[PDB]
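Follow-up to my post from last week.
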Amino acid sequence: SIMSYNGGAVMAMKGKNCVAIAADRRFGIQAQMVTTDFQKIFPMGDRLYIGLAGLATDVQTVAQRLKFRLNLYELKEGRQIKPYTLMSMVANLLYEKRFGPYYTEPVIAGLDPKTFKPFICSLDLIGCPMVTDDFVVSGTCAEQMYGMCESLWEPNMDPDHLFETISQAMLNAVDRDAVSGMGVIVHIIEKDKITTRTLKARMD
Amino acid sequence: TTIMAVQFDGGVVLGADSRTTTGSYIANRVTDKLTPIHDRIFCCRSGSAADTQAVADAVTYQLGFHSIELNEPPLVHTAASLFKEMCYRYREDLMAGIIIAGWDPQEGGQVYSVPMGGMMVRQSFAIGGSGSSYIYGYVDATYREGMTKEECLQFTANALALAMERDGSSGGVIRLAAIAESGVERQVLLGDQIPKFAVATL
Amino acid sequence: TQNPMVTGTSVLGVKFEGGVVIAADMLGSYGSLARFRNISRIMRVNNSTMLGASGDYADFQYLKQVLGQMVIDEELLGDGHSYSPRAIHSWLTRAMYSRRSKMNPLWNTMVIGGYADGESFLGYVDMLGVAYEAPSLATGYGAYLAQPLLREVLEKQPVLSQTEARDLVERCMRVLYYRDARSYNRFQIATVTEKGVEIEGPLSTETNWDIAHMISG
Amino acid sequence: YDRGVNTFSPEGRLFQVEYAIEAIKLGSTAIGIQTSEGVCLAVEKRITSPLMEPSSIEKIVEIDAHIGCAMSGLIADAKTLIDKARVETQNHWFTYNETMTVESVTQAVSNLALQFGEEDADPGAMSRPFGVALLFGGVDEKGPQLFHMDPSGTFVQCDARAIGSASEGAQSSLQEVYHKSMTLKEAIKSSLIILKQVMEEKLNATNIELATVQPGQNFHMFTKEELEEVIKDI
Amino acid sequence: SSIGTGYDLSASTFSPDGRVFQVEYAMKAVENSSTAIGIRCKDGVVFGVEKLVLSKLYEEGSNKRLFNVDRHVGMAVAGLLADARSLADIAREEASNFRSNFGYNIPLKHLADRVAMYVHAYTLYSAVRPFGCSFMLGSYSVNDGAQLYMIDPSGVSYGYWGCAIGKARQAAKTEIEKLQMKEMTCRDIVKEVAKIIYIVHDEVKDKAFELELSWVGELTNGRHEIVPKDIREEAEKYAKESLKE
Amino acid sequence: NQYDNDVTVWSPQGRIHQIEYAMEAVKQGSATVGLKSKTHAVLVALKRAQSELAAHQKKILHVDNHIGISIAGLTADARLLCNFMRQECLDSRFVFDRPLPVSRLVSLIGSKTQIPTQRYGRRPYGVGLLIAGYDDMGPHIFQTCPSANYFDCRAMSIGARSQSARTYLERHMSEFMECNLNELVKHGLRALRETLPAEQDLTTKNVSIGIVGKDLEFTIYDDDDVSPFLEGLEERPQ
Amino acid sequence: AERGYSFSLTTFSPSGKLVQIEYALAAVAGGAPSVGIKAANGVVLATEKKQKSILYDERSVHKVEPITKHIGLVYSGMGPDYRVLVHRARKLAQQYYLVYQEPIPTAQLVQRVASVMQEYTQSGGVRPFGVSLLICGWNEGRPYLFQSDPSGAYFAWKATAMGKNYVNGKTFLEKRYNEDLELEDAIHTAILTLKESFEGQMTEDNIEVGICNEAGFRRLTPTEVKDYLAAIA
Amino acid sequence: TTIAGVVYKDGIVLGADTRATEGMVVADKNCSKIHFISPNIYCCGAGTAADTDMTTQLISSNLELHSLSTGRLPRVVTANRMLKQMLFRYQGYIGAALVLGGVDVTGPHLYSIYPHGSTDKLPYVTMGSGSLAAMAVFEDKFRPDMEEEEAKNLVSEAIAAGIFNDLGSGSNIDLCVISKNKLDFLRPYTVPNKKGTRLGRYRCEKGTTAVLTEKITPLE
Amino acid sequence: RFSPYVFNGGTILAIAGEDFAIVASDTRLSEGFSIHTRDSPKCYKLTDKTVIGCSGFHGDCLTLTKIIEARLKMYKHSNNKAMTTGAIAAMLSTILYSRRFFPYYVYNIIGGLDEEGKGAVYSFDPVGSYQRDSFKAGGSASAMLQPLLDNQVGFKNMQNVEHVPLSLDRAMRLVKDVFISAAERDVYTGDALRICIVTKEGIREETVSLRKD
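User reply:
Got it. Predicted complex:
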């Protein structure tokens, strides 16, 4: 498959007044790993991140064109973008290529810049949006991530517990996938700060 | 699908089954396959539902504008020619078997066939659709020059009943419509109103 | 046309003294179904030429329309000029080759007959643009069944009368009705003389079936 | 008062074409002579400063090994036509494997005649006529030929012809001295003589250019020394 | 009735009194043209044209102002000739396309409407100029009857029993209104047409001329045809003799 | 003067001045004559030279085996039209394998030339043509003007001082239909001759002849191939 | 046949003026007057919808038009131009909604419409719009009132007037109006500033009013306008 | 996916399930399949999710423009025409299967719209992988001129049939009731499905995840 | 599906002498196992010094022929002269290559005189690769004709035999002989044989009978 050509995993998780997004760090071509520091999570404003898994080229390209349109948005209007709005923007961007799609399944995680209410979502390769109140996953180890997230996720979690949960989910899901891993990175974001961590992970 | 049209003196008679299938499943067991193109011009559709609906709408539009611009009741041959043009020009992209029939103050009651190729021919009677195959013989041995309107009605009713009995892609209810200078008389034969034939026993 | 639908089979043609005769059954077949048993596959193209078509009937109707318009357009001028049979043949050749080269052919095989300036004309045009002249022509199964008979006669008596030609044509059509499963016992004969183009109505072929009683011995 | 570029005068002419003809009358004068031994083309360089390198002034160019061209008027406009002519000859060679006739090349360049206009045209079409007169000198199956072309598009074969500011005088002088049996030497000599007559500066080796095309020899532009040997015999 | 201060240089410009002078000038070009008349009776339509000969060097039947637009539709023009020919080509193409798309011969009123819309299209923009011609279309059918329409440079199209265009328009019309064409036959009409032409002709200002005559009716099975040399010369003789009174 | 500069502008009196000014371009060209018998069609044209050291302008062009033309006016427009006619003839032979009827070629020229007399920024063709042809209806001489109008002539002449030729031709029309080729070309040459002062006359240097007929493809004669025609004329003296 | 003039009809004068724009503004300052007031909890638009006969059906054409569910428009100047701009504005709003799935901010709509207006001052073969627009909107809690002129320039107002006597209406507004007004009081002073010009008996069918609170834009019923025109309610 | 629609005495009942699957894995347990077209017109969507989304949104937009211009409430025929013509133009490459229902000046109207552009006007329709079960329910228990609660019960029953008999369907039931003077966008109708209560606490305590790198970024 | 090509058979031969050129072909037009006609020669006179033989797909043969005619006329109009044989060869090369991605299914052999009056033969491939030859056979029976001509005209594999130039007489009887043998072994070759002789005098045409089976 095309999505499995580079592999990778991206997850987002809701908390109390916080939110989390994580991704593995492997960039490989089929069986061969090329790099272990590949960026799959991109800041789209303060307290608003997007996670892109799938074909590495389209990860980078979608990220870049997204930053393009986003910067234009934040210039024309005098405000940072709302999460729903970013989701609709990405959806539009992906559906523009309905018959020649980018091979990425984006995940959005952020807090409403006006309020603080956590928001998460995921989209098709052709931009079908899906919002949940618990978690979203995308990647070559989707079934694994689902398995972990359905068993670990509690509703009203505090930053530390959200962290531990999303970290264990990502680690244990990725460790049952051959083309995902070589490290995990987690952004846990709350109203006042953003914590970025790299997990101790297997490198095989 | 089984469609049928018979021409008589004062006008024409149209008949169709009501079964629309997607595979072996019946998406619609009560389809209207007799479609008004003008006040006294109808078409019988067969083939792709999307194709025939689209084409019929387009022809209705064109013919409406045409009739307004001429300030005259449109010719049946004209509607038939419009169908012919569309069905021939896009013959590789359409799957449609059409029967255009109606009345016209200039040439009276008329029936035209526009089969899948895009050719057009006038006929005394016309049949079309999957089920038509099973009633070619019957319709050939039962037809008779100079039928009355009610005779043509009973005729199409019988033929369609037989076809529907034999063809799996045909069935449901029978829709009839007589067209003449008088106007349009539509009726529906269902259940026991549908002609029955003695089934072999011993 | 990529997939022919309603089709007509063989078309026959033969030159004779001061004229040309063309024959074709009135059947439009839908695969193996004898669906439309009363259509003409012969067109009068002005007063000195005529056309017969095998293959897709819809494309034949299209060609009939275009040609008709051309003839009308020309006769509007009244400049004492008219399309010769050879000219119609040339045009048809160019058209078929053009459609062929666009990979969107007219699925027809056509026989053009004509009489002009004291000479008989008989031309064959393919759907690929293969065209030629000959004293006798037969499309489809006629090319396998009728043409050997026609040639057999014409290489023992090159000059035929109208009657000899008509008889020959009737015999050939009979053979076709015997051996072609997509023919019909109802045909037309079209003739060009200096008097113009005549299209004789529905003719039947007499058939013999005595060999039905030669089973055992 | 502004009118279209394709407007007729009540006399039946195109204003732009006529004004272009007028624009030629300011050009450097040029002389062509046709002869059974070859065709010669001579033109004054019109150096306006000692600081200007005169070798960068070419009013005579090679269209092909058997066809040369001398130009007068707006040289910038001439460059386009020259290139088009060369391309034309090369296309003809490519297609038919044989050289172009001088008349054919001339006709080709003449096809770009009244190909100007405002409305109903390509966005890369010419807005005005070419303000240039041309003299084609060549050798083919019909022998040595010489043709003349003006912004009207009308081209004609000529035995001896002058274009430029001193066109009339030079043409008269040519008429007085031309006969269909001259040698190439007499032709070149005559050309240089009349040129010296009409030129305002003193004729010398770095003041004009001269080129010949003979049946046995490809297009040749005369060197400085080769020019000196001729100017010697004034 | 004569304003020319830039208000008459384009068809995209109204005059302050609500007029388009370019169209009026084209009409004026029609007025300066030789006269052509057409008349409709109970079994068809007849056309007559006063074709002025500018030189004896021109052949008989040069510069015809009678056209075959369709096998059932004839056309008579007056005004700038080349324009008339172009409009004839337009009419022909319209009729052809109608046949190809609908299967039957185009109704005359419809052909008229179409060509007239085409003509009107040239009276709106500065990019093009109005047609310097007026024309008549004649036709006959058993299902429609005999029909005669007229179209002017503005794009106006009307149905007539009798009509005329060119120099002697009104005089010709006065001569026409004396006829009871609703009861006469084309046969009887040809003579009257030729007659009215010979009357209306001005032999002093205009030198020699040639008479054009066109049939279209039940006598011709609906085909627009030229009047035979016989009937033509008969009508001409009738005219010349009727001219001496 | 405000109805002078655009072809899309009618004058208040029903005229188009650009068309007429274009017509004036025909008169600026050297005279040419064309006449027909019942078997042959002949163009005769007075060539014309700038200076004595320049050859004489081509006046007769070949179009198709059965059709040739004589030009008068802008030579560029002449070559334009010539290429158009050639292409149309080629098209006709390609599609129908029969030569293109002369009257139809002419009609096509009319259609093509009418177009730019109605569009803004466009100009009429500044050239008049005489067309000699032969088809199924015999010989033909046609005349085309910048006004996009055309005429079927029995004989004609256009260009500078062509009124004289027009008069002469108008005198001897009744002879033409029964003349032989030599006599026809003779008459054409006389018609062309009357367009000159008594000082100058025809030569093998300033005359081009073009003939087409039932037994002869369109052919152009000039230089020494004209001599057999001229050497057979009456030295018309003042 | 037709193509199009490709040159500007609007050009700089030697004084540095875009004459056609100022003439367009002259066309605006000759039309029926309109008033707009932003009032803390809402916005009011009102205009003189004075017909020319009793034959005119005033229940057929409107001057106060909705653009979406939260944005409204009125104008001063030429009607047809306004109608064009209304269609265009609605289209723009819907494009925005299709891309962002979020109702268009009033300022953004104003900017886009203004861009369209600017095009017709520079593109070929066209004259500028003879219309000034007043645009009201509810977005992000706050209320919004903008004005866009034929040059394509726009301004945010607390309150303003356009059309005939717009200067005196403007002064009247500057004095007899200020912030912390409820929408009701704003409607009151709006009909009051329109009445400073409406020559004749100002009925419930002589003027048109539209409101914009955080419940959406809507046109006031003639009944409600009658109740307000009772110099009370 | 199981979507259905029915015509009752006072209007129209639309029904849908809420499961969204990617392959044979449930991605969404609470997907909204009932889309807003106009205040009086709604549309259930099966087939390619993105295509139904964009199609339905586009038509909603164009219809808002239409009603804004006309000043009247949109008709259902209009929605049907726009949808079917757009879909036919794309020759089935837009995988939108739709149940379109609404109330007009001419009354209640229910169409089913197929991705190729064919439509059917019927008193009851079903679309989706679970359409045959729902259709069975309808063909067994449908009568003309039902009352509101009866119709709601019938539709919810059909959607339930789909939910429990089709692997493509599941979770909750959404209804949308549209009458001449009421709009009941009940979401969801009734969730006949529940995750079983967690028997364990797999809660991880702080420090149980080893960290290699940390970086705190203060905001504002 | 649909194939725009069909093989129509036909054999073609051309020989170049010191002062002559022969271009010969059979007259049979066939398709599949049938005879379309027995009177359809593959030779076409282009100029008075040049003849071309075209074998293969008949539709392309016709089309190509007419294109060549039109373009000859065009060169004449444009240059006031006729095309030389070499010029026609080169032009043909370009015409054939213009269809590089949808070829004319035509094997062409040009035979005529150059400008020195000497015999010239040009052989082509369907995309316009062309060379000059002393003699060349193309078409169905090409492989039967070529080796004999290599033997009797090229004197290949012949020891102590005088290298006398080919006379017209001998060339003619050679052409007749090879076509007679080909008619025996090739089912596509037969019915009749047309020979075109090209010399300063012009173009002669001779017709010989072949067997009709």
